[PDB]
Design a binder for this molecule. Structure first.
Ligand SMILES: CCCCCCCCCCCCC/C=C/[C@@H](O)[C@H](COP(=O)(O)O)NC(=O)CCCCCCCCCCC
Ligand SMILES: CCCCCCCCCCCCC/C=C/[C@@H](O)[C@H](COP(=O)(O)O)NC(=O)CCCCCCCCCCC
Ligand SMILES: CCCCCCCCCCCCC/C=C/[C@@H](O)[C@H](COP(=O)(O)O)NC(=O)CCCCCCCCCCC
Length: 202
């Protein structure tokens, strides 16, 4: 109890889904960055092959955590970056947010594909399909090929759930929860970008 990462995730993101759906939504950077850090333990359930993905995501979340001590909300964070004209500058808060947002969407589609792929001990199909939908349009060739290689170093479905410390029943519940919770959040984040004419495809 409390060594169950899927449950720390579902709880944290259900709070954010309430904030985002309520009127006049103000998403705190502390609260947002914390929930994003709760995804990081999902790496280290994967092989050593995905340590390049783990470092990149964690580094970006660390930045958002570091930003959370000076910046009030996510909106304020983006506004400050527009005003400093560094939105697309490498390592900026807003740019990291966009990549992190894709990371959340990646987890979402993966959970969706995993739940569907029940009766198959291979994570090859869910992982491949989900990466193709979320990250393939944004990653260069070398990154995409390195990823397809790392797909062979993936654990089995049973072993993933074992390391996540859940049986099939509980896992499918807390995964479906995140999928439900993250959807309005991803939409909210997408809209922050679109409503400010920043785009989301860069
Ligand atoms: C269980 C199935 C796992 C499928 C494989 C997971 C897919 C993650 C592959 C991402 C490779 C990260 C290397 C790419 C780095 C950069 O090119 C970009 C842009 O960075 P910038 O130049 O702006 O500094 N980084 C990203 O797009 C961040 C993506 C990391 C988020 C990964 C989420 C993994 C989802 C959960 C996996 C436990
Ligand atoms: C070390 C790996 C050895 C395998 C080499 C054989 C693989 C066949 C490569 C087929 C050609 C790849 C198609 C080219 C895609 C281009 O769009 C990209 C540039 O766009 P972006 O990456 O941003 O999507 N091509 C590249 O970035 C380089 C293509 C790699 C070609 C083989 C690399 C081997 C280099 C050997 C150097 C001594
Ligand atoms: C030389 C040693 C590397 C041979 C690897 C064989 C990979 C089978 C063919 C894969 C191709 O699909 C890709 C480029 O096609 P695209 O991804 O655009 O559909 N080539 C490689 O992965 C190399």
């Amino acid at each position: 109890e409390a060594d169950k990462p899927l449950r720390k995730i579902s709880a944290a993101f259900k709070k954010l889904a309430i904030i985002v759906n309520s009127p006049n939504p103000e998403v705190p950077v502390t609260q947002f960055s914390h929930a994003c850090s709760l995804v990081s333990p999902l790496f280290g359930c994967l092989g050593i092959a995905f340590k390049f993905a783990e470092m990149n995501y964690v580094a970006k979340v660390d930045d958002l955590v570091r930003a959370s001590s000076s910046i009030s909300t996510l909106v304020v964070m983006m506004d400050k970056d527009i005003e400093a004209d560094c939105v697309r500058k490498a390592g900026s808060h807003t740019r990291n947010l966009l990549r992190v947002k894709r990371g959340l969407d990646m987890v979402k589609v993966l959970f969706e594909q995993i739940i569907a792929s029940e009766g198959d001990n291979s994570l090859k199909d869910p992982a491949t399909k989900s990466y193709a939908q979320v990250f393939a349009p944004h990653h260069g060739w070398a990154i995409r090929k390195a990823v397809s290689l790392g797909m062979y170093a993936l654990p089995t479905r049973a072993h993933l759930l074992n390391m996540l410390k859940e049986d099939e029943a509980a896992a499918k519940i807390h995964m479906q929860s995140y999928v439900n919770s993250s959807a309005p959040l991803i939409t909210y984040l997408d809209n922050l970008f679109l409503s400010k004419q920043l785009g989301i495809d860069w």
